[model samples]
Target chain A: GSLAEWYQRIPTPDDLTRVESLFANMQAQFPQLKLEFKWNQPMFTDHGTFIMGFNPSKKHLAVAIEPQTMTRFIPQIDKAGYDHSQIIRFPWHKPLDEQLIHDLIAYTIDQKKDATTFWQR
Target chain B: GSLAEWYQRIPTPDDLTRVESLFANMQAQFPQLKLEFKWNQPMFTDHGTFIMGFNPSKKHLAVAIEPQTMTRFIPQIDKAGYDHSQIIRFPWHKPLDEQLIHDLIAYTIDQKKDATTFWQR
Candidate 1:
């Protein structure tokens, strides 16, 4: 039940530390993105659209992105040695790859803009 | 010019027949899902978020799903000999596996429910 309840509670110190660093780095690189929390997780959105989120799970911390967004960095992600998915998983005990995280977030935000424009009039 | 306009065009009879059959099977299995046209493609949604979409391309038809949902049936999908990604591609002229399509829709709906509940406080 705590796993389920985790979404409603504020993120823990460890979670905040990990996610805040990534968020700050992302904003510095992609100055146009607006980062906020959604579902108790840090969400980076652009132009009022959901781009990606961060979740600190029991064993791992995940960077979740839409697949269209993920595809752009598939090669770099594979090369960077981070596990790839719609949600990229990083263990809590491991150090986050700051550059890869920044690139992935930048890629996702751009793709979100393209996808939204493709569907919008 | 027509490529961008295609999203607004109604499904051709060929498109309709293929999508209608797929939709019928999906609806029978997952009665809670509502099938509708979005961006000129057939989309199945639950609670207004897109679950999947059907796109008829020159060479292939694609069934797109969220990667989190795609992971659940990865093995079965890999075994089915279909091209896999966050989007599953089937050739336009080829016959579809009604059973597999039905099962995939059912599984995705379940995943969507779990994901939605996981985030919704």
Candidate 2:
């Protein structure tokens, strides 16, 4: 899978380790999810529909959920202690919020089970 | 601008000219539109709202409109003699349907003039 290629492209060791750890944890927990790359980011999919994605940067790893899901989860996102606009950012300086990530994934998958398009919109 | 960079990336001279001609015509007609690239495809926006986009390929140039516009124009798409799903495809063998494209652009701009999102959901 391009997941390996994605990991190799991460410039910083700490950022790489953090992204690897997060992906590993998510993959182990959600075995049904397929890890793939699209739109130049590493994303997870279920039956051809986008589940979520992560973009690694020098400062943080940004999580991309569909806007609807992202908007609905704003309170949960704030509760989990992250500032966000369209997508949530887990700053490299802070620990990954695995619980929030997990819940968001579960909610997105459930909400989009019947969605046919690659993008929900 | 990146439009020159985009033109440089086109591998085929015929395809390059076709895209350039089409973009030029569009730009001339809609001077208010911003030409840009996103999702690896060349697109246009008006005041941050996506108007339309084009994806170039070996066989055809696909036009991307929001699903609503696409659905509404299905009959026009067929009447114009093109097969389509979410986007209309203008085959390389065919002359660019300038009128259809112009009408779609005008309709999209009119429909989305008040939209705030980059993409119409």
Candidate 3:
């Protein structure tokens, strides 16, 4: 199954839009990369290693990150929102901040590929 | 100094709205308690113990919770946003979710007082 299949795996009460936008925003710039299942949920990776995945709870979503990349994104993530160890939780009811989501995905790709963007957020 | 002064103490880049409303919401419900400074930053305490505090960063605000109280609100905070071991971070530019902040402050008050709420969030 693909990302859509994994989307189905998300619990019914979860926000499906959050799942799609994460993939949609990331895929737009890095169309070469695709979503896959890791830990039985949707993941964003280039097969270079884990970029991101979603681990949901009854009331929220956890934006899970790869171990090494987690350290580098720490500063940006801290500014963007809360820290859930490796998971960045957002209220299920809150509209997913697509810009923030895109920013997160861009960093993951840039970091993994050793590519750099001129300006930083 | 008072809560407003403590608001002044928050580093310039931090969200002033976050600080003002945090104090405002909590004080409205439990008017007797007031804001104070502890560790040279704004704190919400009931005199029995530390309830909550703001430890601001150059780009965000940290909602620091008392050690024991941390366990009680973990579930709600997870849904509401990010987790920072002891401090939940919110972006400086993003409008602070006052309803969420109020919920946090209310929980801290109720928990520290050993008071129970009829309905749970």
Candidate 4:
């Protein structure tokens, strides 16, 4: 009942589907990246830092990224015309841009590698 | 040359400092949470989903949070007068609000518990 109860209480079914699709796409593209569900969200990690994940909100679904990664890629992202910000917002009716999303994922992964070395020192 | 090249190329030292402090604080506050560097950023995980992190941009250090959690806590966050967004921006010269950040981390932990249940079903 614990699990079922939680699912039943989720704000909406769309939220679940949206997040699931996002993770599936990530895993499909980067099979080597380790994937796991934590804190009720799908998290992708290579070494230890998280790459990205999907979050279903009241108005729409959002892809959450580490702030630094987002900032680093802002220029490329803006050039691509994919809407982004500290928090990206997407309405349920809007179609997700798979290619752009994939590109963003790739960028995040690349930036994360830069992040790891500082801690090593 | 590989790692050193990356660190040297990082945009700024304050950005590095902010992110380090954010991760250090998370680890210090929640010792049970696993911390790792990936894609050049610190990511915290419990069970699997990414929790939170600090990011340094040209202007400031921003803490990134999952949209769902951010939305759910908007009222509380607003009441606390904390600046928040899908991507929250903080200036480099400003001191990171350690206490508010701690509270936000705690809230994120609680929400993640509820999120885990949805996936199990």
Q: Return the top candidate by TM-score.
A: 2
Give the per-residue lDDT of model 4 (tens digit) for A16-85: 5544454565556556556656656555554444555444445444444544344444454444434444
lDDT of 1 by residue, A1-121 (tens): 3434544443466554544565566676556567766655566655455555555544445555444334444444444444433323322233333333333323333334334322211
lDDT for each residue of candidate 2 in A77-99, tens digit (9 for 90 to 100): 44444434322322323333333
Ranking by TM-score: 2, 3, 1, 4
Of 1 and 3, the candidate ranking higher by DockQ: 3
State the TM-score of the second chain for every model: 0.54, 0.63, 0.54, 0.49
Q: Candidate 2 chain A — worst ten consecutive residues by lDDT sum?
A: A85-94
Model 4 CA deviation exceeding 4 Å by range: A1-121, B1-18, B87-121
Pairs that clash in candidate 3: A82-B82, A82-B83, A83-B82, A83-B83
lDDT of 1 at A119: 20
Candidate DockQ values, in order, are 0.03, 0.02, 0.05, 0.05
RMSD (Cα, Å) of candidate 4?
20.3
lDDT of 4 by residue, B33-54 (tens): 5665555655564444455543
Q: Which stretches in model 3 have alpha-carbon errors above 4 Å?
A: A1-6, A9-14, A86-121, B1-121
The sequence of per-residue lDDT tens digits that candidate 3 reaches over residues A73-121 is: 4454445465434223333233433333333333333333332321121
Ranking by lDDT: 2, 1, 3, 4
Better of 1 and 4 by DockQ: 4
Reference-based lDDT, each prediction: 0.45, 0.50, 0.44, 0.43
Q: Chain A TM-score for model 1, please?
A: 0.52
Predict model 1's lDDT versus the native: 0.45
